[PDB]
Design a protein around this ligand. Structure first.
Ligand code: 6U3
Length: 482
């Protein structure tokens, strides 16, 4: 075998280009915790030293007074101002400044806050600090819903009917010229109603700079709701997109390195949604048959490659019961539900992020090699007979600084909830059915505490409906998610 005792040694062994010893976590709560546990576990496996990578957390006074756990957990911490996100966690200039001063070699922002802000990887890059996420050029291309959909369309990925249906760019960096935006947008209600005629109702009237989304059911209530999206986000171009019909939101999980290699990691399915929120996510997305899902994975990989994506991102689609599907978006970050994917794929995602930020290519990540059925520490490249998902995972959102829930019911279920009082439970079974029933048994146990009873019993029932056991897709028009 081989031995590495420090991050600098690891980089030499695994053909990387930047040594990361210390990471600044630009988040709190469960995200901070997850980042540290996932990376520490990989540190132990690799270096036999769980502290081989050090962590620095930012800490608001709210969190310091409370003695939130992530503080104790971290190697060193930096007090930051209280208030709303612009001060502290979503303040790019503050993040960079703290990163430069420590110093750290990279930043992980997770999800929330500043994770989607391209200024973050731009300002880090200029200051020579790594980002655990995609670079700003990729983040910009996906920043505008207009540029994003027409990029998708030029790769011949299916999209829903909309104001810029059929628009295309000539296809090293992909750009979308004024001409295309002008035809993809609607300037005013007149043009909106003309556009609405090619698309049909109901549609979303939506502002590409922003949240700022309205649902319109007819030509008669369009003008008011348009004037409303306009006045909500001033200066934004707006476009229109039709709703899907008998559909679910689903996601391909992509992982890319810094050399143009990208891999799909199965996907996720949102089987229950309410008021624009993900109540139940599943992995893999069994609702979609393989032949069709593999094509959605090929589409996401194409998209990821052409915008020059790095790190872990998700490609969101809409899937109809009649097998049709449509690109919606590339979310340029980890999501809170990512453990679903880790579990079924045996990929430690934040440790994959860390290694990729060190310039390690995909075929040198042990987890990826094993997934693709290769030796754990070989060096030969791999072309991304597909790997099989390992079992099935239900994740459920639970409701009414962080409390953990290790369930007595099963080693296969775990959850958490946070005061500033919502969270998730994650359940693994050998198949969908075992995963559901593990979940139910765990929630029955949750529902013993007075704080969760009312809300969890509601959830238990939801998981026990024939429509859920059968994985039926709701009829009618599909609402958007946040
Ligand atoms: C029974 O645990 C399951 C079941 C189904 C799916 C996922 C899990 C678990 C849930 N989970 C945890 O078990 N743990 C503990 C520490 C108990 C752990 N490290 O085993 C977690 O910390 C944890 C955390 C911090 C999770 C999380 N943080 C943010 C979102 O999810 S999910 C999760 O995710 C796996 C954790 C090990 O690495 C691969 C993911």
């Amino acid at each position: 075998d081989f031995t590495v005792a420090s991050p600098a040694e690891f980089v030499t062994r695994f053909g990387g280009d930047r040594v990361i010893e210390k990471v600044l976590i630009a988040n709190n709560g469960i995200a901070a915790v997850k980042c540290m546990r996932s990376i520490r576990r990989w540190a132990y496996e690799m270096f036999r030293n769980e502290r081989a990578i050090r962590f620095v957390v930012m800490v608001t006074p709210e969190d310091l007074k409370a003695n939130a756990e992530y503080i104790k957990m971290a190697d060193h911490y930096v007090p930051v101002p209280g208030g709303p996100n612009n001060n502290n966690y979503a303040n790019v200039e503050l993040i960079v400044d703290i990163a430069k001063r420590i110093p750290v070699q990279a930043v992980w922002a997770g999800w929330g806050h500043a994770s989607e802000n391209p200024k973050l990887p731009e300002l880090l890059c200029k200051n020579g600090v790594a980002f655990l996420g995609p670079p700003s050029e990729a983040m910009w291309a996906l920043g505008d819903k207009i540029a994003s959909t027409v990029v998708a369309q030029t790769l011949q990925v299916p999209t829903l009917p909309w104001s810029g249906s059929g628009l295309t760019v000539e296809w090293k960096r992909i750009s979308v010229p004024e001409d295309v935006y002008d035809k993809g947008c609607v300037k005013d209600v007149d043009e909106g109603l003309e556009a609405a005629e090619r698309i049909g109702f109901p549609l979303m009237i939506k502002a590409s700079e922003g949240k700022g989304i309205r649902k319109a059911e007819s030509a008669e209530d369009f003008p008011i709701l348009f004037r409303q999206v306009q006045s909500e986000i001033p200066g934004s171009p707006i476009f229109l997109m039709k709703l899907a019909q008998h559909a679910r939101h689903l996601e391909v999980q992509i992982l890319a390195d810094q050399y143009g290699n990208a891999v799909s990691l199965f996907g996720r399915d949102c089987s229950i949604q309410r008021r624009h929120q993900k109540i139940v996510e599943e992995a893999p997305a069994t609702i979609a048959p393989l032949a069709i899902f593999e094509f959605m994975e090929q589409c996401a990989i194409r998209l990821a490659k052409t915008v020059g994506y790095v790190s872990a991102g998700t490609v969101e689609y809409l899937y109809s019961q009649d097998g049709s599907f449509h690109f919606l978006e590339l979310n340029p970050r980890l999501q809170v539900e990512h453990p679903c994917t880790e579990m079924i794929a045996d990929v430690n995602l934040p440790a994959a992020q860390l290694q990729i930020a060190m310039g390690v290519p995909l075929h040198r990540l042990k987890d990826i090699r094993l997934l693709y059925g290769e030796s754990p520490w070989g060096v030969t490249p791999i072309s991304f007979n597909p790997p099989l998902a390992r079992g099935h995972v239900i994740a459920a959102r639970i409701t009414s600084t962080v409390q953990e829930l290790n369930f007595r019911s099963s080693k296969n279920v775990w959850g958490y909830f946070s005061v500033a009082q919502f969270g998730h439970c994650f359940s693994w079974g050998e198949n969908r059915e075992e995963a559901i029933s593990n979940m139910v048994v765990a929630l029955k146990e949750l529902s013993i505490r007075g704080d969760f009873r009312t809300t969890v019993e509601y959830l238990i029932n939801l998981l026990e409906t024939e429509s859920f056991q059968n994985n039926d897709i709701d009829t009618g028009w599909l609402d958007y998610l946040i």
